Every structure is written in structure tokens, then in C-alpha cells.
Amino acid sequence: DDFVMIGSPSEKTFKQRRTFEQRVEDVRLIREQHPTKIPVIIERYKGEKQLPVLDKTKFLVPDHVNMSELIKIIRRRLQLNANQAFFLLVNGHSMVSVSTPISEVYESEKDEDGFLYMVYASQETF
């Protein structure tokens, strides 16, 4: 007689929402108009327990920007505590020791579909 835990429907991902073709078609299209901006997908880990949702999912990041400038920008967008724990993984990698600009990461690390995919969470292991 205290608190009941409503189960998420499912916490539905971007690919879950968009089709593989719509995606290659957003990617191509958007990088037609924005050839300096990297098309990126940023999501909250499915088990995430501390950090809120980001308000959007898709982002363009100017290709000169380095990864570590990206983290700062996410903590700001999320309005985070300076003392709150926040990691950002890409193909299983914490991006916090990372020097290169997004463009360098984007060609090497991008999905089949075109987007660069990254996940954030208050931990680095799962």
C-alpha cells in the first residue's frame, strides 16, 4: 500500500521509430544541405536511472568539433550538475579520451545508415 511501479511500454529507440530507408534518406538529404554538419543520433541508455531524457534526438555537429567539446555541450543541453556522472559511448567507447574531430570519428565510426550513433548514461559499463 505504498508505491506501484508502472512499467514503461518499451522505451523506443530511433531505429525502432524510423525505417532503414527513411534514415539513409534523412542522412543523405541532410548532408546534402549541411556538408559541414555531421548527422548524429544521441540517446539515453535503456537502463538509465539518473539522467533525464534529452529533449531532442537528432543533431548536427560541425565537423571541426572534437568529442570532448561534445560532452560539455550535452551536459549543458541536459542542464547537468558539474558533479553528476555523464558518459557518452560510441560503438562501445567512452568518448572522454578522444582528440579527433567528429568528421574523423564519423567516417570511421558511422552506422550503415549514415548517422553517427551515441548513447549517454551515468555509468560506462553494462
Curated annotation (Swiss-Prot):
Pfam families per record: ATG8 (PF02991)
Membrane topology: Lipid-anchor
A GO term, aspect molecular function: phosphatidylethanolamine binding
UniProt-reported outcome of changing residue 64 to D: Increased interaction with WDFY3/ALFY, no effect on SQSTM1-binding
CDD domains membership: Ubl_ATG8_MAP1LC3B
Keyword Cell membrane: no
Domain of life: Eukaryota
Annotated InterPro entries: Atg8-like (IPR004241), Ubiquitin-like_domsf (IPR029071)
Gene Ontology process terms (BP): autophagosome assembly; autophagosome maturation; autophagy; cellular response to nitrogen starvation; cellular response to starvation; macroautophagy; mitophagy
Post-translational modifications reported in the UniProt record: The precursor molecule is cleaved by ATG4 (ATG4A, ATG4B, ATG4C or ATG4D) to expose the glycine at the C-terminus and form the cytosolic form, LC3-I. The processed form is then activated by APG7L/ATG7, transferred to ATG3 and conjugated to phosphatidylethanolamine (PE) phospholipid to form the membrane-bound form, LC3-II. During non-canonical autophagy, the processed form is conjugated to phosphatidylserine (PS) phospholipid. ATG4 proteins also mediate the delipidation of PE-conjugated forms. (Microbial infection) The Legionella effector RavZ is a deconjugating enzyme that hydrolyzes the amide bond between the C-terminal glycine residue and an adjacent aromatic residue in ATG8 proteins conjugated to phosphatidylethanolamine (PE), producing an ATG8 protein that is resistant to reconjugation by the host machinery due to the cleavage of the reactive C-terminal glycine. RavZ is also able to mediate delipidation of ATG8 proteins conjugated to phosphatidylserine (PS).
Tissue specificity of this protein: Most abundant in heart, brain, skeletal muscle and testis. Little expression observed in liver.
Subcellular location: Cytoplasmic vesicle, Autophagosome membrane; Endomembrane system; Mitochondrion membrane; Cytoplasm, Cytoskeleton
UniProt keyword terms in alphabetical order: Autophagy, Cytoplasm, Cytoplasmic vesicle, Cytoskeleton, Lipoprotein, Membrane, Microtubule, Mitochondrion, Phosphoprotein, Ubl conjugation, Ubl conjugation pathway
Function: Ubiquitin-like modifier involved in formation of autophagosomal vacuoles (autophagosomes). Plays a role in mitophagy which contributes to regulate mitochondrial quantity and quality by eliminating the mitochondria to a basal level to fulfill cellular energy requirements and preventing excess ROS production.
Quaternary structure (record): 3 different light chains, LC1 (a cleavage product of MAP1B), LC2 (a cleavage product of MAP1A) and LC3 (produced by one of the MAP1LC3 genes), can associate with the MAP1A or MAP1B heavy chains. Interacts at microtubules with CABP1 (via EF-hands 1 and 2) but not with calmodulin. Interacts with FYCO1 (via C-terminus). Interacts with TP53INP1 and TP53INP2. Interacts with TBC1D25. Directly interacts with SQSTM1; this interaction leads to MAP1LC3B recruitment to inclusion bodies containing polyubiquitinated protein aggregates and to inclusion body degradation by autophagy. (Microbial infection) Interacts with Hantaan hantavirus glycoprotein N; this interaction contributes to the virus-induced degradation of mitochondria by autophagy, which leads to degradation of host MAVS and inhibition of type I interferon (IFN) responses.
Record-stated family: Belongs to the ATG8 family.
Protein name as annotated: Microtubule-associated protein 1 light chain 3 beta
Name of the gene encoding the protein in the UniProt record: MAP1LC3B
